[PDB]
Every structure is written in C-alpha cells, then in structure tokens.
C-alpha cells in the first residue's frame, strides 16, 4: 500500500509541465521491496489534447523485453496532484485493456523546472499491493540528476543515493509514439 501524501511544488507551472513533450525517468525509488524489477525503463508525455489533460506512458524491461504503453485522461485533485485512469494501448493507441475500476494512479509533481522533475506515483492495479514510487525525470534521457532536483529529493526527506538509475539499461524510446498517444 501507499503511505505518502506527497506535497506538490509551491508555484507549480502546469502549462510548462503539461506541454506535450516527453519526460524520461532517469532514477527511481520504490518504497516497497519488490513491486517492480531493479530495471524497467520508463518515459511519459503529458499535455493537453483538445482541451483534456492527458498522460501517455511507456514501460520497457530490457531483460525480459516486456513492453507496454498506457494513456489516461487526468483529473485534478489540487495543483500538482492528479488522478489517472489508465488504459493499456498499443503504440498506436489501440485499446488493449479498457479503463477499469481499481486501475488508476495518482501522481504529485513535487519539483519541476524546464529540464527536470521529481514526482511521486501511487499505482493501484487490480489485486497487486503496490507501494509508493518516486521518480526523477529529465527532458534529456542521458542527463545525470542536477543540484535542483537532488536538493528537492533531500527536501522531501529522501536520500538520492537510494534511487536506482535507469542509465545502464541502454533503453531506446519511441518518442513519436508517446507524443501521438496524447490524442488517443
């Protein structure tokens, strides 16, 4: 189960974050021992499509090759805090698993600037018992975490040294699919 009420960034700039561009996960911290492997790659695009706040997701496990995309319409809880009812889709937006009761995530944007972000995610999916996840994002898939985002990790009373990097997984992303999924 999740245990954190993450606090959103003071002065969060939603239009800059939700600009339709891609964010790559560079580092992550899963609070429950084994909800996820020590290497999925992940990326997302977030934006407004025909007036609707949307987020598209990509996951890839470079060892198993397990791959999946999702798209969600987002609902607002407060500035920087959103609820996402996800649908599993192929890379072209064709539905594989419809929106389902019990299938949603919340996320909180704890820190963001033009190039980097720190988010909290609480995923709910069927009968899995999942815990809190934190992720450091960058607009550049190769960027080492800089001082603004690392300081934000500290300010959340977390230790960046505990975060697991995705950089040695050598993941390659279909950015075009993420951006186009925002409309689907």
Residue 49 backbone dihedrals phi, psi, to 5 degrees: -125, 120
Nearer to ligand HEM, 36 or 49 (CB): 36
Out of 117, 121, 153, 158, name the contact with ligand HEM by CB under 6 A. 121
Q: Which among ligand [N+], ligand HEM, none contacts residue 160 (Cβ within 5 to 8 A by kind)?
A: none
Residue 109, both tokens: 């944007």
Q: Is 133 in the site for ligand [N+] (CB under 6 A)?
A: yes
Burial class (CB in 10 A: 0-12, 13-18, 19+), 35: middle
Q: Is 4 in the site for ligand HEM (CB under 6 A)?
A: no
Q: Is 123 in the site for ligand [N+] (CB under 6 A)?
A: yes
User: Smallest distance, Å, CB 132 to ligand [N+]?
Assistant: 10
Question: Distance between CA atoms of 72 and 129, rounded to whole angstroms?
Answer: 21
Nearer to ligand [N+], 114 or 163 (CB): 163
Question: Distance between CA atoms of 184 and 116, rounded to whole angstroms?
Answer: 26
Residue 124, marked binder: no
Residues 6+ apart with CB under 8 A from 174: 58, 91
Q: Is 124 in the site for ligand HEM (CB under 6 A)?
A: no
Catalog residues that contact ligand [N+] under the rule CB under 6 A: 36, 123, 133
């Amino acid at each position: 189960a999740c245990t954190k009420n993450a606090i959103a960034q003071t002065g969060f700039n939603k239009d800059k974050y939700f600009n339709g561009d891609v964010w790559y996960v560079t580092d992550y911290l899963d609070l429950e021992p084994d909800d996820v492997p020590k290497r999925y790659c992940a990326a997302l695009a977030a934006g407004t499509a025909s007036g609707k706040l949307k987020e598209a997701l990509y996951h890839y496990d470079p060892k198993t090759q397990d791959t999946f995309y999702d798209v969600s319409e987002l609902q607002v809880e407060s500035l920087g805090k959103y609820t996402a009812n996800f649908k599993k889709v192929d890379k072209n937006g064709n539905v594989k698993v419809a929106v389902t009761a019990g299938n949603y995530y919340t996320f909180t944007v704890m820190y963001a600037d033009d190039s980097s972000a720190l988010i909290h995610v609480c995923l709910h999916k069927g009968n899995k018992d999942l815990g809190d996840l934190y992720a450091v994002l960058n607009r550049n898939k190769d960027a080492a975490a800089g001082d603004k985002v690392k300081s934000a990790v500290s300010a959340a009373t977390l230790e960046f040294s505990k975060f697991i990097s995705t950089k040695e997984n050598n993941c390659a992303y279909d950015n075009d699919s993420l951006k186009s999924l925002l409309t689907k």
